[PDB]
Each structure stands twice: as C-alpha cells, then as structure tokens.
C-alpha cells in the first residue's frame, strides 16, 4: 500500500530495483527491468498504492538519470488506470 | 502553502494558468506563460509549497500535452532549490 524510496541510498540503478522489489514486495523472480516493473504494476501489485520518493534529486543524478524512466512507468500505470499516488518529496 | 489542481476542470492550457494564478496567488499581472511562472516561482511564491495535481491525466490530454511543461517548471524550481512537494494523485 505505502512504499518509500529515499534517493539518499539509491547509489545505483540496481539499488533502485532492489528497493522496489522489497518495497512493492514484487515477485521473487523480479528481473529488475522496466519491462518486469510494468508487468508487476499491471498484475502483481495491489492497489491503492501511495509511493513517496524522498529526495528524487540524488536518486536521479547518481543513476545516469535512470530514475526518470522508472517514475514514468509508475506515471504510466496511473494513466492506464492503476490507483497510484506519487509524492515527490 | 498548499495548492490544488484538478485536471477535471482544466479544459484548456489557459484554464491551467487561471488556476495557478489563484491557487498560488500569483501577481495580478501574471502573464500566463512558463516564463512568468518561472519568475513567480523564483521570487513571488512563498515556500514551503505542496502542490497536489489530482487526475493529471485529463489535464494532460485535454491540453495538447501542455501540462507537462508547466509541471517541469515546478520540477525545475525544486531542482534549483525551491522547497516544493509534488503529489501526483
């Protein structure tokens, strides 16, 4: 239901997926890829879901800007329909 | 401090600026343009500011996708430094 990401520790784009896997309790085989996140967003994850991304800045820069694609996947699920709330603190 | 935009009514990109003007209590001469928003974000508006954008979907589509540039201005102010919180509900 509630997920929390602190760009403080996401030193890498793999850090990002390792965190989402636990936070969103994705499946054990989570392939750590936008494709696997989408599918997970479209079938495994249980909504409502409110995601708080603390300090999106760091997590953005310390990842070659690879955090913005992940966020867009979330922003896309919401679009298609998923009940997601995203707090960019 | 707290601003609320409901893409439910932002039928146009001018609706967007008419709303920001009131919600953020921008100046009477607010020119309704990204340039005037930026400046307003960089001197007039008082922080902390928590901006809630309900149903960003509609407000995105029913505006030729012109809502994304506005949001990026806010995402930029935050970047440069502004104390802004963005809830995309």
From Swiss-Prot, chains A, B:
InterPro entries listed in its UniProt record: Barstar, Barstar-like_sf
Pfam family, one: Barstar
Family per record: Belongs to the barstar family.
SUPFAM superfamilies noted in UniProt: Barstar-related
Task of the protein: Inhibitor of the ribonuclease barnase. Forms a one-to-one non-covalent complex.
Keyword Nucleotide-binding tagged: no
Protein name (record): Barstar
Localization terms from the record: Cytoplasm
Gene Ontology CC: cytoplasm
Keyword line: Cytoplasm
